[PDB]
Amino acid sequence: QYSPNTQQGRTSIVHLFEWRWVDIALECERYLAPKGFGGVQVSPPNENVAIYNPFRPWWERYQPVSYKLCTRSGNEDEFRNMVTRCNNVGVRIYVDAVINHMCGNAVSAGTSSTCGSYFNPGSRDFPAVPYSGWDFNDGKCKTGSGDIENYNDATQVRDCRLTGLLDLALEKDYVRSKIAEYMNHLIDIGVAGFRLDASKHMWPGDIKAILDKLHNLNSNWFPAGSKPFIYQEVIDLGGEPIKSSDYFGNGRVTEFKYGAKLGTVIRKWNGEKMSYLKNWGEGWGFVPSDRALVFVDNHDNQRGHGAGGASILTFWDARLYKMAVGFMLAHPYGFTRVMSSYRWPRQFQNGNDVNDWVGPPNNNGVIKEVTINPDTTCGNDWVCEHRWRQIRNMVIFRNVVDGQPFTNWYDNGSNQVAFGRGNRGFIVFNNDDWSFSLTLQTGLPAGTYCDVISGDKINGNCTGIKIYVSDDGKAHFSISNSAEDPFIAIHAESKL
Numbered sequence: 001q002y003s004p005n006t007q008q009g010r011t012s013i014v015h016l017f018e019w020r021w022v023d024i025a026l027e028c029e030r031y032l033a034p035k036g037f038g039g040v041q042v043s044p045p046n047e048n049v050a051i052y053n054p055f056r057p058w059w060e061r062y063q064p065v066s067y068k069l070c071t072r073s074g075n076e077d078e079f080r081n082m083v084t085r086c087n088n089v090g091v092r093i094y095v096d097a098v099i100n101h102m103c104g105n106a107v108s109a110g111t112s113s114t115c116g117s118y119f120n121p122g123s124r125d126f127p128a129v130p131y132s133g134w135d136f137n138d139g140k141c142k143t144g145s146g147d148i149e150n151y152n153d154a155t156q157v158r159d160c161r162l163t164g165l166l167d168l169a170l171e172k173d174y175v176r177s178k179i180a181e182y183m184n185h186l187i188d189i190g191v192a193g194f195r196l197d198a199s200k201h202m203w204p205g206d207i208k209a210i211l212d213k214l215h216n217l218n219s220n221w222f223p224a225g226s227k228p229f230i231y232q233e234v235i236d237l238g239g240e241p242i243k244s245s246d247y248f249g250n251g252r253v254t255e256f257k258y259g260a261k262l263g264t265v266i267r268k269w270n271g272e273k274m275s276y277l278k279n280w281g282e283g284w285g286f287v288p289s290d291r292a293l294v295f296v297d298n299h300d301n302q303r304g305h306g307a308g309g310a311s312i313l314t315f316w317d318a319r320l321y322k323m324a325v326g327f328m329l330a331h332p333y334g335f336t337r338v339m340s341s342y343r344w345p346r347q348f349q350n351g352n353d354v355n356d357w358v359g360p361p362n363n364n365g366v367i368k369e370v371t372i373n374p375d376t377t378c379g380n381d382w383v384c385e386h387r388w389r390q391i392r393n394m395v396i397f398r399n400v401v402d403g404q405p406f407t408n409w410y411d412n413g414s415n416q417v418a419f420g421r422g423n424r425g426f427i428v429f430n431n432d433d434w435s436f437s438l439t440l441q442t443g444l445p446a447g448t449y450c451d452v453i454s455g456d457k458i459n460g461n462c463t464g465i466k467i468y469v470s471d472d473g474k475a476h477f478s479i480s481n482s483a484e485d486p487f488i489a490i491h492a493e494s495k496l
């Protein structure tokens with residue numbers, strides 16, 4: 001479960017949210033491979049309901065119709081082409097597996113699906129799988145509505161419909177088998193692992209039973225006996241009976257407390273300050289590092305659709321976002337996932353975004369290609385956070401310091417902190433409303449290092465800030481609170 005199966009040295013995966021297969025494949029070859037990214041989490045590759053009201057919202061992909069690899073991102077041939085091209089370049093693919101449910105019970109019957117498959121939610125008929133009434137929890141769920149109504153009852157959270165979504169009877173070997181058939185088809189294609197959507201809504205034992213039916217990774221790309229990477233999405237902010245710890249026997253779990261807390265800290269809410277990050281990790285009530293999948297924001301909470309609150313930092317908060325991501329990437333806790341999104345017309349009304357449903361950039365419903373600008377940014381409204389110099393260099397920073405311990409922590413008792421990773425890297429943050437100018441112990445060998453936040457090491461020179469480490473590991477750092485990026489990061493590979 002617990003190993004990403006990334007190519008030794010690569011320590012992060014990027015969520016290319018709503019990206020088409022052809023675009024990801026190209027991205028693997030032209031960027032992800034050279035820039036050292038470990039892998040890519042793709043949007044659900046299985047056929048979903050085509051929702052026209054509202055117009056093709058991103059969430060329509062979380063409403064399965066069948067397991068055919070046929071979506072707005074592409075067909076099976078295009079999917080396999082992507083997985084092959086990415087794998088050949090040492091970049092892995094992780095599937096967002098929507099296996100807890102099919103579509104909303106209120107969806108009209110017909111062929112309004114991404115591959116034209118017929119389906120009848122009212123009669124529990126999904127002939128493309130095939131699933132029937134006997135494959136759903138309608139008779140198992142004990143709530144008066146048939147939907148999840150109270151999260152204090154761990155049973156209904158698993159047996160009832162999540163927001164009306166037809167709940168599959170995962171206890172049945174047949175259902176478990178159909179899911180494994182889908183997942184094994186993906187594995188044999190070359191996928192390295194999966195994001196198990198809505199795992200909180202599935203019994204740990206049912207997930208286990210499904211996992212027991214999965215093959216090992218494709219032996220053409222991975223060593224024999226490689227088990228697929230499994231990260232279960234379990235939204236657990238505490239306060240509820242269901243604990244993500246119940247799922248440790250299956251693989252890793254998403255640690256949503258990570259981004260929720262990091263956001264409150266960086267935004268300085270409730271008296272929170274960066275100096276408190278000294279004991280970041282399990283010390284904050286987080287799951288064990290080796291069982292955590294961390295991220296600042298995800299596809300849900302970046303638009304207020306999951307959990308984390310208004311504290312979640314997103315690309316909209318570029319400056320603070322870059323700092324949060326940088327902290328995350330520098331800190332040894334958990335396996336890191338970088339978000340990559342698309343811009344949408346956020347329109348807040350009475351405290352909520354009325355356009356939180358808006359799907360990816362499109363022309364009449366057809367997702368737009370990802371275009372690359374000369375400055376390496378993306379066009380067509382794709383944000384491409386993973387391409388931002390500050391984020392991309394921190395992804396590399398993580399690879400360079402991999403395995404090194406958390407050391408040489410410094411803090412001013414307020415919001416100016418710093419720490420290193422063994423003798424391979426050092427990072428400094430200034431989130432106070434005043435300047436930071438001080439000599440700190442870096443733990444790095446003497447020399448001149450390029451700050452990878454403000455610049456890059458190119459042709460034996462630094463394009464941005466330069467840091468001079470003395471013979472007794474010390475270096476002077478100066479960061480104004482008005483600096484473009486109020487943080488500096490240096491490592492073994494940015495040394496001149």
Ligand SMILES: CO[C@H]1[C@H](O)[C@@H](O)[C@@H](O[C@H]2[C@H](O)[C@@H](O)[C@@H](O[C@H]3[C@H](O)[C@@H](O)/C(=N/O)N[C@@H]3CO)O[C@@H]2CO)O[C@@H]1CO
Pocket residue numbers: 059060061062063098103104105106107162163164165197198199233300305
């Ligand atoms: C009547 O309820 C409707 C809702 O109003 C409508 O917004 C939508 O619900 C949307 C919901 O708002 C979205 O955040 C998203 O919700 C999914 C999240 O993206 C995903 O990360 C998740 N993790 O547990 N669980 C959800 C199911 O996979 O996908 C569902 C299904 O598309 O479909 C429901 C059923 O038709």
Ligand SMILES: *[C@@H]1O[C@H](CO)[C@@H](O)[C@H](O)[C@H]1NC(C)=O
Pocket residue numbers: 459460461
């Ligand atoms: C670094 O840049 C300077 C000019 O600013 C140049 O003299 C020097 O040769 C460059 N170093 C390398 C290794 O190219």
Ligand SMILES: [Ca+2]
Pocket residue numbers: 100157158159160167168201202
């Ligand atoms: Ca369920």
Ligand SMILES: [Cl-]
Pocket residue numbers: 195233254298
């Ligand atoms: Cl997630």
